[PDB]
């Protein structure tokens, strides 16, 4: 390399991270839900998470054993983190857990360390909101404005001569 | 409707102070507001007067419960943005900045508030579950 | 209210009250059309080419024009740079050899000599 | 006040210019000859003769034919003879034109 | 009166107030008021009626030479 030349920037194999990274600081499927959480069976639980019926969500978590609820909250954060497009459905699960077992969650020595993933995860969605509203308003005005805003006659000489 | 539209048209020509009251008339409906701005606001001066009046009121009380004036502002800008910025009055620009300042604060208000709206929701729902 | 355009041996006629292409005419000859003249009434359309001159009668049927080719040998063997209508019947044709004559649908017209 | 019917349903498209040729050799010292003309070659067989005097006014058009084009143009200007125009139509043929007719 | 890109009208009962890329033309060639240029190009211009005017107007890939924009 020419000594006059300046060394270029290369990230290489460096590990990226964020400041929120607080790791080192009938019809119910409850029994399956309790089953998979205890045994960490991703396949079994994913089937349980596939239910989109709100009444099922409430009833299942209603009977879930309160200690198992905490680990469920942790796991939903991870599954949200990997796939953000599933944010909508999974907040419902986090919601119904929080209200029903809220009394239990109060009587816990520490929450932030064990629920850090949720807080970081939930925080990210909030940081989007101010910008999206700006996008919506600009996206609002434009649509708002724009919503308001031979053979039959042919004469062929050759065919006429022919007939 | 037609009478109020004519009255507002007359007051705009007459430079009457009653313009706010005409805009505050409850008879106004959203389709009518579109028709008035599109059809009757043909002069830059009338557009400036309405914008100055409405902006001043909202700036004074951005949290007024009545949605009529905000409706007037939102439709005024969407349909006459090109004519509005064409206005070269310094006072009109100054009134804009004041309206921005009050509304800018309101945006800062919202994110904490939305949490509080949620934070009460479970307290109500949790209370309902206890009742059951 | 007819607008007539001719390009590359194809004549298209439009009527405007809003416009409707009432008829279009396709001609055999490879030669492009030099000029087209329409009678004041519009019933008679003359299509002119250097090789030949052809006249076609236009008749309106059901918001459309029916075309019939009136047969006149003299025009067919006549070269035409320019052609115009005196009236609905009589025309003036200037042949490629500068011969001006009148045809009733030839009455030659005397022309002053030009000094070389 | 009169009604204007602005009509664009009529489409006339010219042919691509294919060749260009002047009828005289350039002579800076001498004055422009009265007979100078410019020949325009078209892809649809048309030869257009234009006059560079009085801005540019177009004098006479030679009409082309179906499936006929122009690929080359040359002028012959021999003293005492009429200007002669020769064209190539993309075939094994050289065509000399009667400028009179 | 009209050309390829202009249309004009003149009244012959009123007299007017007295108040580069072509040959210089040193040699001989041989040997009430309305003007508009709005309509162009013009194929043909003529009246339909006393108050109706006909104006007929004209309505291939290209080698890409980008125009730098910043």
């Amino acid at each position: 390399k020419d000594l006059a030349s300046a060394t270029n920037y290369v990230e290489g194999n460096a590990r990226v991270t964020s400041g929120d990274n607080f790791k080192h600081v009938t019809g119910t499927v409850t029994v399956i839900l309790s089953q998979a959480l205890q045994s960490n069976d991703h396949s079994l639980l994913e089937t349980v998470l596939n239910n989109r019926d709100e009444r099922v969500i409430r009833d299942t978590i209603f009977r879930l054993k309160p200690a198992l609820a905490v680990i469920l909250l942790e796991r939903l954060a991870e599954r949200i983190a990997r796939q953000t497009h599933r944010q909508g459905p999974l907040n419902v699960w986090v919601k119904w857990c929080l209200i029903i077992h809220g009394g239990y969650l109060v009587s816990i020595p520490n929450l932030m360390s064990t629920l850090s993933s949720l807080h970081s995860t939930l925080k990210r969605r909030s940081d989007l909101l101010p910008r999206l509203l700006a996008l919506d308003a600009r996206l609002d005005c434009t649509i708002n404005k724009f919503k308001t805003l031979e053979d039959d006659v042919e004469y062929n000489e050759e065919l006429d001569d022919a007939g | 409707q037609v009478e109020i539209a004519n009255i507002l048209s007359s007051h705009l020509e007459a430079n009457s102070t009653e313009i706010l009251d005409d805009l505050m008339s409850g008879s106004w409906t959203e389709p009518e507001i579109k028709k008035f701005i599109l059809t009757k606001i043909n002069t830059v001066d009338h557009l400036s007067k309405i914008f100055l009046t409405i902006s001043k009121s909202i700036t004074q009380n951005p949290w007024n419960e009545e949605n009529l004036l905000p409706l007037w502002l939102k439709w005024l800008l969407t349909l006459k943005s090109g004519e509005l910025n064409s206005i070269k009055d310094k006072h009109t620009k100054k009134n804009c900045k004041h309206l921005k300042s009050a509304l800018r604060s309101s945006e800062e208000i919202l994110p904490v508030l939305l949490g509080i709206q949620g934070r009460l929701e479970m307290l109500r729902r949790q209370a309902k579950l206890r009742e059951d | 209210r007819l607008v007539v355009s001719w390009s590359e041996s194809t004549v298209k006629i439009w009527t405007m009250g809003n416009y409707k292409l009432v008829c279009k005419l396709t001609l055999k000859d490879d030669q492009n059309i030099s000029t087209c003249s329409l009678s004041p009434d519009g019933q008679v359309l003359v299509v002119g080419r250097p090789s030949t001159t052809k006249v076609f009668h236009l008749q309106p049927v059901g918001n459309k024009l029916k075309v019939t080719k009136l047969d006149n040998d003299l025009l067919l063997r006549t070269s035409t740079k320019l052609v115009k209508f005196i009236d609905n019947s009589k025309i003036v044709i200037c042949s490629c050899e500068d011969d001006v004559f009148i045809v009733d649908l030839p009455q030659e017209v005397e022309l002053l000599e030009v000094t070389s | 006040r009169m009604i204007v019917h602005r009509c664009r349903f009529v489409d006339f498209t010219p042919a691509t210019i294919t060749s260009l040729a002047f009828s005289h050799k350039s002579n800076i010292n001498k004055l422009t000859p009265s007979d100078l003309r410019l020949a325009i070659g078209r892809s649809n067989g048309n030869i257009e003769i234009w006059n560079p005097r009085n801005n540019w006014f177009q004098e006479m058009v030679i009409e082309g034919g179906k499936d006929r084009s122009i690929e080359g143009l040359c002028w012959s200007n021999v003293n005492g003879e009429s200007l002669r125009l020769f064209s190539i139509g993309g075939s094994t043929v050289v065509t000399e034109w009667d400028l009179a007719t | 009166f009209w050309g390829a890109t202009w249309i004009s009208r003149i009244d012959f009962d009123v007299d007017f107030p007295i108040n580069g890329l072509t040959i210089t033309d040193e040699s001989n060639f041989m040997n009430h008021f309305f003007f508009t240029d709005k309509y162009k190009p013009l194929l043909f211009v003529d009246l339909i009626s006393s108050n109706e005017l006909a104006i007929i107007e004209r309505n291939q890939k290209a080698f890409i030479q980008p125009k730098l924009v910043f």
Binding site: A134, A137, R138 | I58, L77, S106, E107, I109 | - | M2 | -
Partner: peptide, 29 residues
């Protein structure tokens, strides 16, 4: 009620930040 007031305010704020073939026309002479 304060939610919709604030949300309404937001939309207003961001808002403030932001040939025919045949034509019939009458000439003037």
């Amino acid at each position: 009620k304060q939610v919709e007031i604030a949300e309404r305010n937001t939309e207003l704020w961001n808002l403030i930040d932001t040939l025919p073939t045949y034509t019939m026309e009458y000439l003037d002479i």
